[PDB]
Design an enzyme around this catalytic site. Structure first.
Site, PDB file in Angstrom:
ATOM      1  N   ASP A   1       6.028   5.944 -13.569  1.00 21.42           N
ATOM      2  CA  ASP A   1       4.749   5.583 -13.303  1.00 21.42           C
ATOM      3  C   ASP A   1       3.742   7.045 -13.438  1.00 21.42           C
ATOM      4  OD1 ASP A   1       5.735   3.347 -11.757  1.00 21.42           O
ATOM      5  OD2 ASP A   1       4.656   4.412 -10.044  1.00 21.42           O
TER       6      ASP A   1
ATOM      7  N   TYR B   1       5.551   0.241   3.857  1.00 23.71           N
ATOM      8  CA  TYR B   1       5.215   1.201   2.560  1.00 23.71           C
ATOM      9  C   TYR B   1       5.630   3.004   2.973  1.00 23.71           C
ATOM     10  CZ  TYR B   1       2.366   3.261  -2.165  1.00 23.71           C
ATOM     11  OH  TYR B   1       2.391   3.471  -2.825  1.00 23.71           O
TER      12      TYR B   1
END
Lengths: 129, 125
Positions: free
Chosen positions: A82, A32
């Protein structure tokens, strides 16, 4: 589930504040990679990192999404904004593009590209004119 | 020319240091949005902005590319590492994702997503 569907489901689960369910779709040893932040390895660490943001509503908007590969494996590219509402009432809106490598309904890598200074400034609390 | 082909051609021209030819594929009124930087409007301004980097060699590597839409119109998404060599021998390699809106073989909007800190750190003299 196709790569495109896997990521679409991941984003839907994040948007329902279902962080456990979303992270279930990450591989156990997922990479990630928030490009300007330290890299995170594995599902548990990814889950823990995401929980560092004390969010009470999440709205990650997908402006565009497309995938390489086939029904089983490929890279899914996303253009997003986001949005988060934090427990203290702070609102964030971070423009980001992200690439997701999927093998058999599991996200093996997730790379999000955004500007860290913008993120840090939105996280900040006359003092000035 | 499809959206995917237009963007592939654009990137090929950039990689040949053919900035006029690359910019010819941008709309006259292109929106050129380096997300953490001021927005640039129009083909002439995009060409001038690209010329601000004194590059003698360019290697923008496309790791992944995929398009929405149809044969005429759509958005092409890219994951890249943009490498440059500058006149003073300094090099850069900036990790970037970009979205390109295309209509009838012209890029009407280009949105590049990267970290400004990383860029500024590499331009350090």
């Amino acid at each position: 589930m196709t790569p495109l569907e896997t990521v679409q489901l991941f984003l839907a689960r994040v948007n329902a504040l279902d962080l456990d369910g979303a992270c279930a779709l990450l591989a156990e040893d997922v990479v990630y990679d928030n490009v300007p932040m330290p890299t995170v390895h594995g599902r548990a660490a990814a889950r823990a990192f995401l929980s560092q943001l004390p969010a009470t509503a999440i709205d990650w908007e997908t402006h565009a999404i497309a995938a390489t590969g086939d029904a089983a494996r490929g890279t899914v590219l996303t253009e997003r904004t986001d949005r988060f509402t934090l427990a203290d009432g702070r609102t964030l809106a971070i423009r980001v593009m992200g690439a997701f490598d999927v093998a058999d309904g599991s996200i093996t890598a997730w790379r999000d590209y955004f500007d860290l200074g913008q993120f840090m400034a939105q996280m900040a609390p006359h003092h000035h004119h």
